[PDB]
Symmetry: C2
């Protein structure tokens, strides 16, 4: 029942490796990591791969852990109305034109954050249109499938399964094992 | 009395080489070229080494050939009042901050044009302050010594001789042999 220490020091066993491989095969991607807490995953991801010269466009109904993780990095944040795509496209165009505040230099990077299924409304995310917009304007995509994975789709694969979207157009996928798997952790 | 053709085809003799070496040694620089007309020199230089994403700050009393050469390239142009240095520094700072028009991207290059001696006023150019500003803000300098070379300085070397400025802080020097040498051409 006991672990040694962090993963990078002594904490890795073969069970972790098997779990990572099996998750990566299940989702449809090439590789994956597993953590011991979902809140921590969201809180410490954007810190690692973002900065204060990049912009984040997040939905207005996103979970608290995404907001904490984005806040701890430094990037500029703008929000768009829930389930409104013309506004999203308008905002993308305007923010590309304007540039960084106080300098108007080009944005170094733009990331769009969303959720598979918003669990206070019961609605979905317009994944096809999000993929179209990200391919047209060269943005990036991040999807949080906490309530979607395991419980939706013909075979239980999530929103990519639902919309027939190829799980390769989405740059980063994350989820948790807490909801529909009867366990703890994240990936 | 006849020449073959252009310099790049058959037109070069050893006399041209001797003249170029002797001019370069006289001025104090490392190399030089000689042309058959001064107006043409000014008209066809900036075309070669500039573009439409660069800015030029020229004095308001500059000769017509400089204006034609700058016009034929495409670069943005701004002028400052004659013999006013606080205005020049203010303009430099403002134009660095603002950036390109309609895009506000950084200026790719900034060039400052001036004349050794303005031959309608009889005044000089504040060369020390120009060198200070170009070294402080990382601009470039271009000096047109048509009336200065040969006729001013303790030994006839121009405005660099007059102000004791080292003829290395000035990126490009040009002049003519028409005024004080009793000949035709430019360098």
């Amino acid at each position: 029942i006991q672990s040694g220490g962090p993963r990078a020091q002594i904490g890795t066993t073969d069970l972790h490796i098997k779990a990572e491989k099996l998750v990566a095969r299940f989702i449809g991607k090439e590789d994956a990591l597993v953590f011991s807490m979902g809140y921590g995953t969201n809180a410490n991801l954007f810190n690692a791969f973002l900065d204060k010269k990049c912009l984040v466009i997040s939905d207005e109904l996103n979970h608290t852990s995404i907001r904490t993780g984005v806040r701890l990095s430094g990037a500029a944040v703008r929000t768009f109305k829930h389930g409104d795509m013309v506004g999203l496209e308008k905002l993308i165009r305007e923010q590309i034109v304007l540039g960084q505040p106080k300098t108007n230099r080009p944005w170094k990077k733009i990331l769009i954050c969303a959720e598979g299924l918003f669990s206070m409304e019961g609605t979905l995310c317009n994944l096809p249109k999000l993929v179209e917009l990200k391919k047209k304007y060269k943005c990036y995509l991040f999807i949080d499938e906490a309530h979607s994975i395991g419980a939706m789709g013909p075979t239980g694969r999530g929103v990519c399964e639902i919309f027939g979207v190829d799980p390769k157009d989405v740059d980063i996928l994350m989820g948790t094992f807490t909801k529909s798997f009867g366990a703890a952790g994240g990936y």
